[PDB]
């Protein structure tokens, strides 16, 4: 059917399924970078009338919808050939849905060599290396901030219940 590669991200949030199209497509030929960045342009290029109810609006009529991307994405060279899925997803109504793909993707070459705290203490420092939680604890141990409430603050929480939890 097509023997291919769907590398990190993966995960198939449907928009992970989408991502995976370009996770083999962009990824091959490595118009990864072109597109990875393309998306970045697009998202917010989009989401106003060139997204909103001057688009997404089903009451636009689908062909016309193509012909307002293909007038919106062959409106932009930010999809010089990865437009087509646009113009497909377009049809396939996945327009509001693009962030997840975009993310997933973009993440799928960023979250395709990163890491993020997920930890029983504060961070959202995030990282772009696979090896980690060693490096970061030197940026943690460095800078002091975040919501503090941001990750575990193992205080109100754990600990906080505990005497209560004994009684």
């Amino acid at each position: 059917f097509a023997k291919l590669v769907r590398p990190p991200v993966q995960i198939y949030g449907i928009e992970g399924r989408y991502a995976t199209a370009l996770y083999s497509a962009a990824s091959k030929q490595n118009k990864l970078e072109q597109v990875e960045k393309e998306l970045l342009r697009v998202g917010q290029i989009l989401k106003e009338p060139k997204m909103a109810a001057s688009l997404l609006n089903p009451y636009v009529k689908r062909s016309v919808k193509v012909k307002s991307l293909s007038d919106m994405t062959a409106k932009e060279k930010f999809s010089p050939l990865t437009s087509n899925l646009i113009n497909l997803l377009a049809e396939n109504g996945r327009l509001t849905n693009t962030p997840a793909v975009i993310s997933a993707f973009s993440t799928m070459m960023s979250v395709h060599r990163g890491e993020v705290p997920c930890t029983v203490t504060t961070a959202s420092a995030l990282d772009e290396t696979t090896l980690t939680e060693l490096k970061t604890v030197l940026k943690s141990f460095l800078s002091k901030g975040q919501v503090l409430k941001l990750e575990v603050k193992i205080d109100p929480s754990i600990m906080g219940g505990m005497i209560v939890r004994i009684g």
Binding site: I11, Y12, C118, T119, V120
Partner: protein, 487 residues
């Protein structure tokens, strides 16, 4: 800590769609922020369908589900003897903790046939009726089927009570670890029950695994499996364990419900059919082990509750096909009076004689039959329409004998007593008595022989297998005593 936390992807209905936890073990019991457990049963690529163990409203989306990283075991050991636990093997008694800080997998399997050795065992319940018509071995699966205080439970207690004596004996082989798995059993019921055991303090060799009425469906679900592991321990330690599953009827219900809630569908009786797999798998682990396990056993006395007496009922039919006989308790007899109330006719241990004790066997051979004949005349006779003198005796006799299998609640017998009281009748010595006077006789006769002929009785037990001497001794003892009982 990355994926040693996960976020509850979405939650409702104890099905925690779980974000993260993919690195998960299959069949991992996981841990909630609510401290609640779940099992990541279904690992879907997207989430983990987590059967959330417990009952809730106590969770919300994004709640952290942290791996526990562990596949279920249940705390195991002999230190649950002297313990009433909830399904997780935690107290509810609140007597502090168990000692069963060993744990042993609920995921453990049935013996190979080589690891198993067939039953030839004795094991008696002290219940005349039982021990007579369904004399018990060990390892065996035997359906107790009986209903909502038919003293349904009462009987079990007496059985257990009987085992006390072995547990007060040093004969492990006649000792039994009793495991009473309570499914759906309301707290009051349990409260009494436990209480009773305490009083009997047979509790000492006894686990009561208790998932009362309120209990979450998985818990109750799990509970048997928990039980399933625990007795096997004893069993590998050569010990003969008894698990009473009372009852899987509730489990199935829960399970189905659970399944249905999983959207996982069913068939018959609205149950999904691997409720069988559930039980089968549950039940195969009941065994009389080969020698390798200290020849242990986990003897399973499963219990099944007949809705409207019905058994043709898929789940009952199932259980029957698994069990090695069934003990029908028939309640009408209870209204009719009769303690116990039994369809004897249905009460069968196909195993039967393989599960025997020779002492009894000497009278019992004859008795099963005489009752068989009596029954045969229950069937032949015992309408409003059938007699001759021959049968009239069988009937008379029969009716008398009935009283002997009649049996009060909270009270089992020692075997020698059983043989005794029976003996009188076997050789027909109390047909002279009306049915009504039998029990009186029996009582009296028993305290008499206990008093004097403990000599004999002790002895009959001793040779474990009657002899003419005993017979003869009995015979005078009884006849004359009988004469004394009466006159």
């Amino acid at each position: 800590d990355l994926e040693e936390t996960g976020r509850v992807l979405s939650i409702g209905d104890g099905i925690a769609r779980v974000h993260g936890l993919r690195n998960v073990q299959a069949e991992e019991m996981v841990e909630f922020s609510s401290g609640l457990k779940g099992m990541s049963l279904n690992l879907e690529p997207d989430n983990v369908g987590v059967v959330v163990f417990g009952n809730d409203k106590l969770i919300k989306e994004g709640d952290i589900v942290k791996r526990t990283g562990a596949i279920v075991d249940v705390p195991v050991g002999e230190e649950l003897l002297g313990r009433v636990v909830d399904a997780l093997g935690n107290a509810i008694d609140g007597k502090g903790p168990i000692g069963s800080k060993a744990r042993r997998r609920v995921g453990l399997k049935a013996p190979g046939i080589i690891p198993r050795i067939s039953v030839r065992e004795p094991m008696q319940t002290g219940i005349k009726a039982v021990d007579s018509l369904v004399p018990i071995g060990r390892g065996q699966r035997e359906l107790i089927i009986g209903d909502r205080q038919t003293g349904k439970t009462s009987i079990a207690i007496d059985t257990i009570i009987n085992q006390k004596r072995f547990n007060d004996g040093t004969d492990e082989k006649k000792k039994l670890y009793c495991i009473y798995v309570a499914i759906g059993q309301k707290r009051s019921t349990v409260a009494q029950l436990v209480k009773r055991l305490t009083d009997a303090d047979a509790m000492k060799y006894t686990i009561v695994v208790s998932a009362t009425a309120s209990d979450a469906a998985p818990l109750q679900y799990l509970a048997p499996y928990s039980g399933c592991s625990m007795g096997e321990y004893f069993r590998d330690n050569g010990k003969h364990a008894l698990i009473i599953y009372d009852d899987l009827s509730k489990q199935a219900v829960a399970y189905r419900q659970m399944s249905l809630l999983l959207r996982r569908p069913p068939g018959r009786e609205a149950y999904p059919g691997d409720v069988f797999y559930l039980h089968s798998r549950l039940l195969e682990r009941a065994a009389k082990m080969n020698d390798a396990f200290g020849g242990g056993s986990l003897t399973a006395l499963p219990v099944i509750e007949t809705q409207a007496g019905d058994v043709s009922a898929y789940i009952p039919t199932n259980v029957i096909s698994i069990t090695d006989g069934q003990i029908f308790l028939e309640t009408e007899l209870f209204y009719k009076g009769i303690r116990p109330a039994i369809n004897v006719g249905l009460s069968v241990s196909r195993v039967g004689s393989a599960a025997q004790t020779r002492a009894m066997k000497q009278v019992a051979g004859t008795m099963k039959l005489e009752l068989a004949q009596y029954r045969e005349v229950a069937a032949f006779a015992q309408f409003g329409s059938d007699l001759d003198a021959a049968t009239q005796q069988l009937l008379s006799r029969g009716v008398r004998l009935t009283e002997l299998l009649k049996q009060g609640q909270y009270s089992p017998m020692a075997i020698e007593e059983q043989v005794a009281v029976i003996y009188a009748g076997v050789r027909g010595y109390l047909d002279k008595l009306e049915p009504s006077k039998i029990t009186k006789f029996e009582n009296a006769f028993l305290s008499h022989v206990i008093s004097q002929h403990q000599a004999l009785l002790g002895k009959i037990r001793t040779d474990g297998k009657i002899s003419e001497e005993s017979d003869a001794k009995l015979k005078e003892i009884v006849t004359n005593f009988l004469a004394g009982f009466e006159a």
